Amino acid sequence: EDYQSIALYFEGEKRYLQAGKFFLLCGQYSRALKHFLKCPSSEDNVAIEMAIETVGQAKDELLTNQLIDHLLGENDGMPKDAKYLFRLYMALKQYREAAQTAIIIAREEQSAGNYRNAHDVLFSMYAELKSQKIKIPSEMATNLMILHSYILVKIHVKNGDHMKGARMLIRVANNISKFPSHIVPILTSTVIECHRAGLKNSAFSFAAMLMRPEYRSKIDAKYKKKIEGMVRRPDISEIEEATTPCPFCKFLLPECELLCPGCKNSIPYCIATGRHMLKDDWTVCPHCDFPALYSELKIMLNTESTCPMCSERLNAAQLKKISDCTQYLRTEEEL
Amino acid sequence: LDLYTAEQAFVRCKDYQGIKFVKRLGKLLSESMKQAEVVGYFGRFEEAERTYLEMDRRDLAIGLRLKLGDWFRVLQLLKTGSGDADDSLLEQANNAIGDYFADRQKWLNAVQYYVQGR
Amino acid sequence: YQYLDRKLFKEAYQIACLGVTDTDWRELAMEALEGLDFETAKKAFIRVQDLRYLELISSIEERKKRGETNNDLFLADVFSYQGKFHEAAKLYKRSGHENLALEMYTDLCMFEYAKDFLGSGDPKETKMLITKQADWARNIKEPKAAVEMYISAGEHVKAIEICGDHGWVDMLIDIARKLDKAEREPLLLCATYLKKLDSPGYAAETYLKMGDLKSLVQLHVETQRWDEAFALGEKHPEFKDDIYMPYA
């Protein structure tokens, strides 16, 4: 019933453990759950979490605003983390703001220099936004792709696949403005791998910008002279990019291009090679439900035990090709 | 959007352009995409761009404003959102605006660009 | 115009920028295309703002970005896309693509001309051309000619379809009689339609010229001919037993 005893069990004497839990039996919870909103520091993350269910009852009032405010640490000064902002925004089901806050957090962390933490965070937010089936803004998908190309780089380098790292590093190079922290060090070794793989023509342009006035006098002091030489004697020799049919229209675009000039839908991308999926070798990680060129996924599963993206255990044969890919290539405008 | 009567008409007026556009429209396998193409067909470019943005395709709006010369529109659209190669378009657009002014003998305006672009 | 006649396109644009009409801009744009200076063409058409020609030029450029070098295919596309339809034809011919010319003339349904661009031969191509012609002929409401137009190619499905659609019971007989080899739903399709048309006069006849004379015998009394029913049941005594109970 009202459970006034639970609601006021030991709520006096300035506290009773989770006094907010006590006031949170029924009704509108605004004594100690809300004194956790009156607490400018984290007395317990459990309390803010339970205030997430406080607005989970869709109370839809200024109490939700108060929680958001304590969240931003604007009146507090020491906000904890906007992961709670994501859960809170999820609660009242305004996902068009949850996606924005997700992107903001990912962008900030990415800029700072965290490059794998940003990946896991953005994957963990894509997780719920997709599981709930809400459509995912192109901003989040695009950032996921360009922030995942980075991890693919390192993997294709450690594995020793000279061309894959070049391709992905080209994509990262094009969107290197998003990457401030290692702006010379990434474009550097973008050049090195491009030349060490066969795309030295592109590396010419990239090293030019690398030797540009702003970027210059910061170039790696290992092979600064080598970079100057490559630019000085630039060869226009670049191996032509291969082609493959678009999955949901029969048309031949290159491997790293995702926007098909034909059907005009945005082809998804692998999780091993960053290319545009092919109907003939579609698959998915059993856990993260993301595409992969089955040939390439199996090829890369060279004792690396976590998935390329979700970072969970994976092995030789819990990965088999798929045929009804229309459940993945359903035209979003048609869907 | 019959695309069957329309092609017959477009042959009844020797009009090979109309037939080819109808075929291309046939390749598209999505509604609200064919709608964007046809509101581009009659020249309502602003309507087509707004439609492209509403269906959450910044990529095609940038592309459409790139096919025409609205490089200022391309800059404004690149101001927000994020795309697959955003510096590439940014630099290309600056250089293109520099060329836009330079042909009209408007230096000190082309020079503002050509510098943000390289 | 002085610059255009000498095929100096970049200078022509440099002078045009000083301010010229829109017709001159368009003329410069066309002459850039035919001269294959696509950058000048892009800037000209931008300054006239034709999305059709700009998308053509972008298509050509995206082709050339991939393996595409031939200069007569591109000029043929340009002539075709303005509307010459004949100089474009020869340009397509000269390059190793007459198939493109065939597609052009079939799209314009100018089939008299596409007769002499069947350079490949008949590797299931001649069927395609004649079927496209006959489809056109039906679409303009000239069904009589369309009848035989299908007949030339393997269009017995389509031929029967239209024939019944207007019911040439004066003709379906002749075609189906000429039709042989007991095709599942062509030689039996006219049969299917003869009992829809006021044509039991031929309904049993056709399947009798296909073979299934048991339900066909029953259909004889579906022509309210009991005597003929028993007569044909003599041929198929089992069918007689099967379809004499309804007579009972």
Ligand SMILES: [Zn+2]
């Ligand atoms: Zn496609």
Ligand SMILES: [Zn+2]
């Ligand atoms: Zn996975």
